[PDB]
Design a protein around this ligand. Structure first.
Ligand SMILES: [Mg+2]
Ligand SMILES: [Mg+2]
Ligand SMILES: [Mg+2]
Ligand SMILES: [Mg+2]
Ligand SMILES: [Mg+2]
Ligand SMILES: [Zn+2]
Lengths: 62, 129, 186, 150, 81
RNA sequence: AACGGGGCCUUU
């Protein structure tokens, strides 16, 4: 109603392209949201590498 | 806002020693203050200075021996050709005999004569006499 | 598992090992002086001449372990200094120093401020004194141009270093080539 | 001196000379952070977190004894807010100065004071945009701002 | 007042000066250690208290905040370190 | 001996 779209085609070609936008950034906040729990895990698996042999070496040296 | 930090220093130096005081409190402390203060003290125009450590940029205390007419600064720090040091030195120095135009070369801080022997040059900084 | 040659690392040497076997004797007394002293080990050791009637003993450390080396420290240096006399015991840090890049040193990997030369030297004079947190500092620029960094030590419980000031002064000279003087509040 | 007023006043906080300690503390830094996020998950601004920590819990500074600084702590724990409290309180104020201005449009001082607060907001946001903490679009706007508080 | 010692000034004049005006700016604030009227548990309270600090359980009032050092309440103890 | 130019070592 603000005369945004010349004809019916330019309205769908905008709608289509619009969905192709927010679903292009839904997949960026999927893939770039995945490496965050990769490095809250792979980085906190290294917290049980360094802390489970220090737990042991306090006990394992008697 | 405080924009030179060096000129704020050489003023306080120049001020008190022209009012008769022997000692001056400088702040903050640039490493460029220090290198200037060096060439000053080593050429006699000032005494010995002691850096002070804050957890800030730090202060200085300079002992004044008298005998210093003016320490000063050229802002902006011009680019200076080599042949154009002669036309600076003739300008602000009291006589061709003594006095020091102190530049900043790529070799680092020095006076105009020390520059002349090395055959270097750079931006201008200040003066001492 | 060999207790005697594990605790160090390169191969050698007869003095570095001698100081190691001294920890071993301190590793058996009481239950808690063993397993707590157990994990704390050290890298190599230097011995440099002090102008007094003694010498300085520098114990380098991998520096995660200054966390626990500090927890004992004075406990050891009220002991290891009885073990070895005519010698002064210090606990240092082997922390690396990355130089200042221009051209002959090139192409990135940054330079965090710890690992910086000047910032590192200020952490050696923090670890030469280890107790007695410094309450202030300053630096004299000479009339010959040279420097004396005047380290202003605390007062409360300074007696542990109250003598070795030469040995701290001699350490920083055999490292940095520039000098030191200490002092107190009057 | 002052940016938007006449005063030159220097009233401030003067931090001691120590890079470690005080000795009397003995409070085990990991216990401190828990108390920080105990307050933060309860939604207290890092400015006012160190207000209670320094007072009630006897922390000279979070800078030392935690190794890290409060909002730079909250950030590492994922409690980092949307906009910094710098802008936030600036907006939080300007909004109320406009709401009060909607009832009084012959109150010209607030109209003039509005321009001061708003200019600060845009200058802060430009900085925050420059150093990337804010999305390069952003751009605080009047009638969408009462959402940034509520 | 012509030549003097800036490096080694007296603490008689330096301690009546301004917090920022000492040769190295010092904090003029301290830290108490406090109890209740009836309780042994020791609170660590800052000399100038903007918050009104509680001693934990039984919700007490240790100090009411002021434009300056907190105004403590009636009676309780303090130790300056 | 005043000064100038070119390289080593010092955690580079
Ligand atoms: Mg369209
Ligand atoms: Mg001012
Ligand atoms: Mg103005
Ligand atoms: Mg203005
Ligand atoms: Mg400040
Ligand atoms: Zn209570």
């Amino acid at each position: 109603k603000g005369n945004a779209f010349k004809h019916k085609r330019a309205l769908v070609e905008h709608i289509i392209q619009a969905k192709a936008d927010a679903q292009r950034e839904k997949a960026l906040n999927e893939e770039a949201e995945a490496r965050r729990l990769k490095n809250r895990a792979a980085r906190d698996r290294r917290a049980q590498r360094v802390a489970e042999k220090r737990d042991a070496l306090l006990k394992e040296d008697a | 806002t405080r924009s030179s930090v060096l000129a704020d220093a050489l003023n306080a130096i120049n001020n008190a020693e022209k009012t008769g005081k022997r000692q001056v409190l400088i702040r903050p402390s640039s490493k460029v203050i220090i290198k200037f203060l060096q060439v000053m003290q080593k050429h006699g125009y000032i005494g010995e200075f002691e850096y002070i450590d804050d957890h800030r940029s730090g202060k200085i205390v300079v002992q004044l021996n008298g005998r210093l007419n003016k320490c000063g600064v050229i802002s902006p720090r011009f680019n200076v050709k080599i042949g154009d040091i002669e036309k600076w030195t003739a300008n602000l120095l009291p006589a061709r005999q003594f006095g020091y135009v102190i530049l900043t070369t790529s070799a680092g801080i020095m006076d105009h004569e020390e520059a002349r022997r090395k055959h270097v040059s750079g931006k201008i900084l200040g003066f001492v006499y | 598992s060999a207790p005697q040659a594990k605790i160090l690392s390169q191969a050698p040497t007869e003095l570095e090992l001698q100081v190691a076997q001294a920890f071993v004797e301190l590793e058996n007394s009481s239950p808690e002086l063993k397993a707590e002293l157990r994990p704390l080990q050290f890298k190599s050791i230097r011995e440099i001449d002090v102008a007094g009637g003694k010498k300085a003993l520098a114990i380098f450390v991998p520096v995660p372990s200054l966390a626990g080396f500090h927890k004992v420290q004075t406990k050891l240096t009220r002991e290891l200094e009885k073990k070895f006399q005519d010698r002064h015991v210090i606990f240092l840090a082997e922390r690396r120093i990355l130089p200042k890049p221009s051209r002959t040193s090139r192409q990135v990997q940054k330079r965090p401020r710890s690992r910086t030369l000047t910032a590192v030297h200020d952490k050696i004079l923090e670890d030469l004194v280890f107790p007695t947190e410094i309450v202030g500092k300053r630096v004299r620029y000479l009339v010959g141009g040279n420097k004396i960094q005047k380290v202003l030590l605390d007062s409360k419980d300074v007696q542990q270093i109250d003598y070795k000031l030469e040995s701290f002064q001699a350490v920083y000279n055999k490292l940095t080539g520039k000098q030191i003087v200490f002092e107190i509040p009057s | 001196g002052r940016m938007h007023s006449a005063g030159k006043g220097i009233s401030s906080s003067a931090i001691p000379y120590s890079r470690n300690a005080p000795a009397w503390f003995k409070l085990s830094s990991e216990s401190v952070i828990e108390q920080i996020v105990k307050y933060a998950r309860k939604g207290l601004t890092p400015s006012q977190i160190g207000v209670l920590l320094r007072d009630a819990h006897g922390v000279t500074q979070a800078r030392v004894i935690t190794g890290n600084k409060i909002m730079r702590i909250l950030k590492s724990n994922g409690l980092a807010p949307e906009i910094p409290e710098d802008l936030y309180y600036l907006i939080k104020k300007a909004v109320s100065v406009r709401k009060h201005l909607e009832r009084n449009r012959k109150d010209k001082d607030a109209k003039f004071r509005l321009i001061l607060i708003e200019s600060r907001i845009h200058r802060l946001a430009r900085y925050y945009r420059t150093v990337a903490v804010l999305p390069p679009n952003w751009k605080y706007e009047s009638a969408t701002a009462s959402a940034l508080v509520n | 007042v012509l030549v003097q010692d800036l490096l080694h000034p007296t603490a008689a004049s330096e301690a009546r000066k301004h917090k920022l005006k000492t040769l190295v700016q010092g904090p003029r604030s301290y830290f108490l250690d406090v109890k209740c009227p009836g309780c042994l548990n020791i609170t660590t309270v800052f000399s100038h208290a903007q918050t009104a600090v509680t001693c934990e359980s039984c919700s007490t009032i240790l100090c009411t905040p002021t434009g300056g050092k907190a105004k403590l309440s009636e009676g309780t103890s303090f130790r300056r370190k």
